[PDB]
């Protein structure tokens, strides 16, 4: 097998067609299914895989109680083929309360973070063996993408942050070759706070649309040069902003360089990608909570910060149903690179008190150049009826 280079053009996208749904919470009501959060999708050259961070427990289990916490010693990265739910035959690939995975065209890299909040370790596991590790540099929850990393010519890049995620003080881009850290670039450019990046190959580079937990309801962009390791950063220009919380569409605004300072604090992992001057992006339908999910194109929304001209809206999850994180993944086709996304469908605590557990399902959509209709594909479990 060769290394991936992703050097094909991006596919024509008219919108997204349904690709996969796991129905994990519905299946957990009558079968042994892992409690999870922070899912993502990544593909080898043949098959797509679903990933999630386990809570070291199945859902119909005494250990499923108090699964709200994001960091515990029992969290592991679960890996299955996409559409195989997380049943007891699922491989735990590493110890992790934060992760990123990608296939370089020869093998899987997993970036696996665990240990103390003040003193976490990232393990780099490549082709089934631990090749490298790094300690927390600013001693305040070392954390990574919770979605796929991107590899070009056998160099994989992952965005990692520590501290309160301030710019150069806290965020680094690691360049990794067969699991070995070969280079580390500090975050440069005007993105002030950068977490949970959703990254895609954009040959020759990698582009990441990220979360700002402090200042922006507009999303940071990080552009990563794979050859000379140089970093630039800015914000998604679009006046229709991708973060939650945010202002409503009539009152929201954005900046191409700076955080917009509108409902800037907190965030959700999400994604966007350029289509010339236009942007395709997903977001929650509700501005103030993780309810519903929609995608659309904003015309000139990659270049023009005054633009609010959306077209090609699709409801993925209707506004009455819970969403969660979402991220991009890229799939190599015959002549072009397609863009796909997943939506985490979070169920249970703290927002739903019918149950003691917190878990997710997924729904997955892929870019289409063809035509498509309408629907809503929510989680679909009835928490009134199933194991507490």
């Amino acid at each position: 097998a060769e290394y991936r280079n992703w050097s094909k053009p991006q596919c024509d996208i008219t919108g997204f067609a349904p690709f996969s749904k796991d129905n994990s919470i519905r299946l957990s009501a009558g079968g042994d299914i892992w409690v999870t959060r922070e899912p993502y999708v990544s593909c080898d050259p043949d098959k797509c895989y679903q990933f999630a961070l386990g809570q070291g427990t199945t859902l119909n289990n005494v250990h499923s109680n108090n699964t709200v916490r994001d960091r515990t010693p029992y969290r592991t990265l679960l890996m299955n083929e996409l559409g195989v739910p997380f049943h007891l035959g699922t491989k735990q690939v590493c110890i992790a309360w934060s992760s990123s995975s990608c296939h370089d065209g020869k093998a899987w890299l997993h970036v696996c973070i665990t240990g103390d909040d003040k003193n976490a370790t990232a393990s780099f596991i490549y082709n089934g063996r631990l090749v490298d590790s790094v300690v927390s540099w600013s001693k305040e929850i070392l954390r990574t993408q919770e979605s796929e990393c991107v590899c070009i010519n056998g160099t994989c890049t992952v965005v990692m942050t520590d501290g309160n995620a301030t710019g150069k003080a806290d965020t680094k881009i690691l360049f990794i070759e067969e699991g070995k850290i070969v280079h580390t670039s500090t975050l440069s450019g005007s993105a002030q706070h950068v977490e949970e990046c959703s990254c895609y190959p954009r040959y020759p580079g990698v582009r990441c649309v990220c979360r700002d937990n402090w200042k922006g309801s507009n999303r940071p962009i990080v552009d990563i040069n794979i050859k000379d390791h140089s970093i630039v950063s800015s914000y998604v220009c679009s006046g229709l902003v991708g973060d939650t919380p945010r202002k409503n569409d009539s009152s929201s605004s954005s900046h191409c360089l700076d955080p917009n300072n509108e409902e800037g604090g907190h965030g959700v992992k999400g994604w966007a990608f350029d289509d010339g001057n236009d942007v395709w992006m997903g977001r929650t339908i509700n501005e103030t909570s993780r309810l519903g999910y929609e995608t659309f194109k904003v015309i000139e929304g990659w270049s023009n910060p005054k633009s609010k001209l959306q077209i090609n809206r699709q409801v993925i999850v209707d506004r009455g149903n819970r969403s969660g994180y979402s991220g991009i993944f890229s799939v190599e086709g015959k002549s072009c690179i397609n863009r796909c996304f997943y939506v985490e469908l979070i169920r249970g605590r703290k927002e739903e008190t019918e149950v003691l557990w917190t878990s997710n399902s997924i729904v997955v959509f892929c870019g289409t150049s063809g035509t498509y209709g309408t629907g809503s594909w929510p989680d679909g479990a009835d928490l009134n009826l199933m194991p507490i």
Partner: antibody, heavy 127, light 108 residues
């Protein structure tokens, strides 16, 4: 759990001040210890807090850089240091224990409200 | 988030119902505590969520509201109850702003 603070202080502008807080019971739990001040005849103001077990602290932007919260299991004490004082910083400083005991990367803090307070520490500042 | 509190002082007779108001600048959901401060002391928690009394708080202290407007009602003020009262939001993300406070003072 009672909370107990260090005695009152009086300082020149541009100097630094140390306030400390101890429990009556065993050495500090996972519940956040936080620092709130009351400016003279005026409203309360949160300025920061620490998870005593994990030692991670966070601060209001108004105090960022010039304040530090430090925890030590051995002296069983949380210490709040404030630097480059001025007339504005003349206030009463309260130690307080939050119901909150964990910070979630994604979701933030649950129950960040104060169940127990120290007796207060006056800090006086004049040229 | 900004917390606005009214009235800035409330006058009430002994053995009479008090009502205090707090308003947020955004939805704080049900995450709104009420504290009582006597002037010689640190604050005491009365209410959390927006309605549950803290341990040992007398049943005459009663809280209600959600989203953006909240109230503390005291059923019949004793000499124990004339104090300053503060709302604070405990929304999931910093900073944790307080209301400027309502003084509750005796009518004669």
């Amino acid at each position: 759990v009672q909370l107990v603070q260090s005695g009152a202080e009086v300082k020149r502008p541009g100097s630094s001040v140390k306030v400390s807080c101890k429990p009556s019971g065993g050495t500090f739990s996972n519940n956040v210890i936080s620092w709130v001040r009351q400016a003279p005849g005026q409203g309360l103001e949160w300025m920061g807090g620490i998870i005593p077990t994990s030692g991670i602290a966070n601060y209001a932007q108004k105090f960022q850089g010039r304040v530090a919260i430090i925890a030590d299991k051995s002296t069983s004490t949380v210490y709040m240091a404030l630097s480059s004082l001025r007339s504005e910083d003349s206030a009463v400083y309260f130690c307080a224990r939050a119901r909150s005991d964990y910070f979630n990367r994604d979701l933030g803090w649950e129950d960040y409200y104060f169940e127990n307070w120290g007796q207060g520490t006056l800090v006086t500042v004049s040229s | 988030i900004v917390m606005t509190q009214s009235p800035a002082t409330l006058s009430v007779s002994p053995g009479e119902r008090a009502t205090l108001s707090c308003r947020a600048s955004q939805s704080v959901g049900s995450s709104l505590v009420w504290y009582q401060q006597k002037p010689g002391q640190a604050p005491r928690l009365l209410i959390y969520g927006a309605s549950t009394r803290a341990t040992g708080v007398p049943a005459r202290f009663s809280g209600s509201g959600s989203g953006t407007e909240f109230t503390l009602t005291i059923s019949s003020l004793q000499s124990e109850d004339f104090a300053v009262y503060y709302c604070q939001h405990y929304n999931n993300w910093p900073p944790w702003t307080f209301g400027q406070g309502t003084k509750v003072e005796i009518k004669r």
